[PDB]
Amino acid sequence: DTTQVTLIHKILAAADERNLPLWIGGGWAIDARLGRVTRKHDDIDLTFPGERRGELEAIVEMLGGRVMEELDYGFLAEIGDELLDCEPAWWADEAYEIAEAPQGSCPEAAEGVIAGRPVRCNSWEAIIWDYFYYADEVPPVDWPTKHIESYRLACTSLGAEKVEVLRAAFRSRYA
Ligand SMILES: CN[C@@H]1[C@@H](O)[C@@H](O[C@@H]2[C@@H](O)[C@H](O[C@H]3O[C@H]([C@@H](C)NC)CC[C@H]3N)[C@@H](N)C[C@H]2N)OC[C@]1(C)O
Ligand SMILES: Nc1ncnc2c1ncn2[C@@H]1O[C@H](COP(=O)(O)CP(=O)(O)OP(=O)(O)O)[C@@H](O)[C@H]1O
Ligand SMILES: [Mn+2]
Ligand SMILES: [Mn+2]
Incomplete structure (x- = not known):
């Protein structure tokens, strides 16, 4: 799906420009670590620095989307017909971590690939x-x-x- 793949690139390019790390999660993170698309994906799961939530919201809005719903763990956003399922990670000594997840959940290294481009994804253990x-x-x-x-x-x-x-x-x- 070219729209999702293009949208992931657009989000990460915008985040990159402002030195905002974002980690792909869920189904796309699996496909990113494999370097292979394995099926259609219903949404894009993202992990973001919790104290920089406003920056992610502003990128969503820049791309023509909006925040849709708050959940107990995070928030959903919609950019066109595509859903972004967004959860915070919080700074923990020398890295961001998803609360209560195994250490290393949000590596600074880009360890996956999507359409030939390295991307940051959650660790296998966090997935x-x-x-x-x-x-x-x-x-x-x-x-x-x-x-x-x-x-x-x-x-x-x-x-x-x-x-x-x-x-x-x-x-x-x-x-
Ligand atoms: C929008 N649909 C989501 C679904 O994608 C899925 O969302 C997961 C969500 O289930 C998952 O939450 C888990 O981790 C939460 C917490 C320990 N993370 C720090 C507690 C609830 C536990 N289910 C999040 N870490 C990642 C998030 N993308 O489940 C809930 C949901 C509302 O159906
Ligand atoms: N109802 C539910 N309650 C709790 N956790 C759920 C859940 N449904 C799925 N999950 C977990 O949350 C992760 C993200 O869920 P989803 O986004 O809903 C499906 P996915 O594996 O990302 O496939 P997708 O690429 O088609 O979206 C899943 O990888 C699974 O670990
Ligand atoms: Mn998903
Ligand atoms: Mn989801």
């Missing part, structure tokens, strides 16, 4: 951690296929053993 929360809200056997396949793909990329010990850590945290 997978959000599926653990999802699992407590819906059993994995009850997930839409696309989400099962995306999870399994992230898990194979990181390594199944690394996933199972991360899952044990999640269970310990939230026991």
Whole structure:
């Protein structure tokens, strides 16, 4: 989908110009770390510096969009027909971190690629951690296929053993 891919470029170019880091998350982050589009994506998940929220809102507005809805964890925005699902990360000693996520959730290095361009994305461990929360809200056997396949793909990329010990850590945290 050329519109989403073009929109991701436009957002990141604008953010780059003002030295605003943004991390692609969710489905697109998986595809970015793989360097391959694997399916249609329903939205664009973004992680932003929480104390610079206004700068991200201003880029959304510059691009002709607007903030649509506040959620418990962040906010949705709409640029044309495309949805941006935006969550804050907060400065933690020497890096931004998503609250309660595994350390390294928001690496300063651009470790994914989208349409040949390096992009910052959330770590595999942070991608997978959000599926653990999802699992407590819906059993994995009850997930839409696309989400099962995306999870399994992230898990194979990181390594199944690394996933199972991360899952044990999640269970310990939230026991
Ligand atoms: C707009 N739809 C979103 C969906 O994309 C999905 O959003 C996830 C959202 O579920 C996810 O939240 C998780 O992490 C939250 C918190 C620990 N992050 C610091 C607590 C809730 C937990 N589900 C966020 N980290 C990332 C966000 N893109 O789930 C909620 C939702 C409202 O259906
Ligand atoms: N109802 C829900 N409750 C909690 N977490 C959810 C959720 N639905 C999905 N998630 C988690 O939040 C992440 C982002 O969710 P979504 O944006 O809704 C789907 P996605 O994996 O990004 O595919 P997409 O590319 O088609 O949007 C998912 O990767 C999953 O980890
Ligand atoms: Mn998504
Ligand atoms: Mn989303």
